[PDB]
């Protein structure tokens, strides 16, 4: 009973933590071109592509690590209860 509510507190804190807004934008760079303009097109597309790739990376390890911590806690309490049952 204690483990269930404890893990619930864990994931619910994790949830209401990670769902935060840290992004605020009104108007950005042009993501879409109709013709070929020159070097400025390269600058624009490259910076925005690097931005989206880096954000995807950030997200990737965010979920990776949080899931890892959830594993560590759940399997830790799992072996603990297995020990106390196999005294």
């Amino acid at each position: 009973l204690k483990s269930t509510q404890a893990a619930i507190d864990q994931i619910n804190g994790k949830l209401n933590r990670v769902i935060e807004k840290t992004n605020e934008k009104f108007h950005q760079i042009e993501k879409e071109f109709s013709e070929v303009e020159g070097r400025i097109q390269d600058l624009e597309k490259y910076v925005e592509d690097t931005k989206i790739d880096l954000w995807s990376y950030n997200a990737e390890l965010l979920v990776a690590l949080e899931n890892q911590h959830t594993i560590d806690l759940t399997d830790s309490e799992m072996n603990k209860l297995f020990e106390k049952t196999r005294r």
Binding site: I19, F26, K31, A59, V63, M78
Partner: protein
């Protein structure tokens, strides 16, 4: 406890571990419809922002309007004098950031020159027409004299002025329209000055005409003075536009309008913002979550499922 059906999730330890429950934080899709609460949505069905500013005859309904997010349908098109917008994106984003169409008229003095010129390529009804916010200046009788107009700014805000330079097709057209063999128009403020000279030449015949117009804009600060000098080929403004600061943007879309109340608008419709991540699109407006490239970010919400 244990359940006969677990959920497989990605980890760093092992690529797919099975737990008892998980969640699907990523928003997967949109409803398809954009809807206008609490935002003020104005539908530019067949005319974009610039055509609304110039005053095209087929969109004279959109006048003195405000908005929170202007939309641009792919079916937009122009029905007036052919033109070109030098550095179009800058002025588009500038006017889009304001969000208003408060056009305040101004009394101008045009001596010796004939105003209100029109062409059959911009028929506002049964007869020839022109733009509503612009005035075509022409010669009167036997001459086109030099013009030096001045307008001050005694207010406490900024003013937007639009003007145009006419590029004729032939030298005979220039001489018959302006006695001066060559044209020149200078806009000037106490800190910003520009000069434009027309270019006589042939252009791709669009709507049955080769002559062109080039539009330019100017910003006047409080206490600044705007001076216009001309000797031919000038399209003068009829007033100015008041500048504001607010949360106004633009988004090209083709989705229909609904009556939902939602703070997140996307070109593919609306989505709820009760989630931290979404994969519908990167281009969002208002309170919208992080954009990613992964639609299957699963979050383990239960213990490891070890069935009996």
């Amino acid at each position: 406890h244990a359940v006969p059906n677990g959920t497989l999730v990605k980890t760093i330890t092992d690529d797919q571990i099975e737990v008892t429950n998980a969640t699907e934080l990523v928003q997967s899709s949109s409803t398809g419809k954009i809807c206008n609460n609490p935002h003020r949505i104005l539908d530019g069905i067949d005319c974009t922002l610039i055509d609304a500013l110039l005053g095209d005859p087929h969109c004279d309904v959109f006048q003195n309007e405000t908005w929170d997010l202007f939309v641009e349908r792919s079916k937009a098109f122009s029905n007036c004098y052919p033109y070109d917008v030098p550095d179009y994106a800058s002025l588009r984003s500038l006017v889009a950031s304001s969000g208003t169409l408060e056009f305040i008229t101004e009394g101008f003095t045009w001596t010796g020159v004939t105003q209100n010129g029109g062409s059959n390529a911009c028929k506002r009804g049964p007869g020839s027409g022109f733009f509503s916010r612009l005035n075509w200046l022409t010669k009167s009788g036997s001459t086109y004299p030099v013009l030096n107009v001045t307008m001050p700014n005694n207010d406490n805000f900024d003013k937007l002025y639009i003007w145009g330079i006419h590029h004729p097709s032939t030298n005979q057209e220039q001489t018959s329209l302006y006695v001066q063999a060559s044209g020149r128009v200078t806009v000037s403020t106490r800190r910003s000055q520009q000069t434009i000279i027309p270019n006589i030449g042939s252009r791709p015949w669009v709507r049955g005409l080769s002559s062109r117009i080039s539009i330019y804009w100017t910003i006047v600060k409080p206490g600044d003075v705007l001076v216009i000098n001309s000797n031919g080929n000038l399209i003068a403004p009829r007033g100015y536009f008041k500048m504001r600061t607010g949360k106004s943007s633009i988004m090209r879309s083709d989705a229909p309008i609904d009556t939902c109340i939602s703070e997140c608008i996307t070109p593919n419709g609306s989505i709820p913002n009760d989630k931290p991540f979404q994969n519908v699109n990167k281009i969002t407006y208002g309170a919208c979550p992080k954009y990613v490239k992964q639609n299957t970010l699963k979050l383990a919400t239960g213990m490891r499922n070890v069935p009996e």
